Design a protein around this ligand. Structure first.
Ligand SMILES: CCCn1nc(-c2ccc(C(F)(F)F)c(SCCN3CCCCC3)c2)c2c1CCN(C(=O)CC1CCN(CC3CCCCC3)CC1)C2
Length: 220
């Protein structure tokens, strides 16, 4: 019933790969990346949203700690509560904790709601990627093989289901006998496959990719 593969980048719903640097803001990149796709779907415009806005403004009230880590779910809740998030162009990324400088004059998106998917359910994750759009997830990236990944379907025997790095599932497929998740990272274009990593799919929640999925929506 579900398509064999989906790629939301091919549907024009994914912005350029970003570079987080030495600031632990992968949660903020994962969240804006999911919302960017919903924004494209609803308005026809593809616009990078401000991860720095989340770093500086979605802070202790949201359980988040800026460059020391955060949640995608509470990032979405900030955008709901704030009734907007600035464009990345107006509020660019500095890889530092800064004062909140959100300005509604440069609001580029809103968020109406978000959804959390059940733990470890790669079938439900697949359905959501097919039927909803890119999904924010955490993965276990504390392995040299992850940092050193260049191409192919990533499979790390010592991976755990305990996540520590936010990323964005923008698709999935089946290539060269291997089912995979298509994952947008925030380590710049020189990481992996032009900034992407394809991660083993249907291998018992490999690297925790389906541990904590969430996605936002923008309602009419
Ligand atoms: C043991 C596992 C714990 N765990 N770990 C994650 C999780 C998910 C994704 C990543 C990613 F790598 F992608 F970044 C990470 S990396 C660690 C992030 N970590 C760093 C230190 C500062 C707090 C951030 C962790 C999640 C959960 C539980 C459910 N999850 C949620 O999002 C839902 C919860 C969000 C937090 N509320 C609590 C309150 C929220 C507002 C008021 C203050 C607390 C409860 C529901 C996802």
């Amino acid at each position: 019933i579900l398509p064999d593969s989906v790629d939301w980048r091919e549907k024009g719903c994914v912005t350029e790969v970003k570079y987080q640097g030495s600031c632990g803001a992968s949660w903020a990149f994962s969240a804006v990346g999911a919302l960017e796709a919903q924004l494209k779907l609803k308005t026809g415009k593809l616009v990078s949203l401000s991860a720095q806005n989340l770093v500086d403004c979605s802070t202790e009230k949201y359980g988040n700690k800026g460059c020391n880590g955060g949640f995608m779910t509470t990032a979405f809740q900030y955008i709901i509560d704030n009734k907007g998030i600035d464009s990345d162009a107006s509020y660019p990324y500095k890889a530092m904790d800064q004062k909140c400088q959100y300005d509604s004059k440069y609001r580029a998106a809103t968020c109406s709601k978000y959804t959390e998917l059940p733990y470890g359910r790669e079938d439900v994750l697949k359905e959501a990627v097919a039927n909803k759009g890119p999904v924010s997830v955490g993965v276990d990236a504390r392995h040299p093989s992850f940092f050193l990944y260049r191409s192919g379907v990533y499979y790390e025997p010592s991976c755990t289901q305990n996540v520590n790095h936010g990323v964005l599932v923008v698709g999935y497929g089946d290539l060269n006998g291997k089912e995979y998740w298509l994952v947008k990272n925030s380590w710049g274009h020189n990481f992996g496959e032009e900034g992407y990593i394809r991660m083993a799919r249907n291998k018992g929640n490999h690297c925790g990719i389906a541990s904590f999925p969430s996605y936002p929506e923008i309602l009419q």
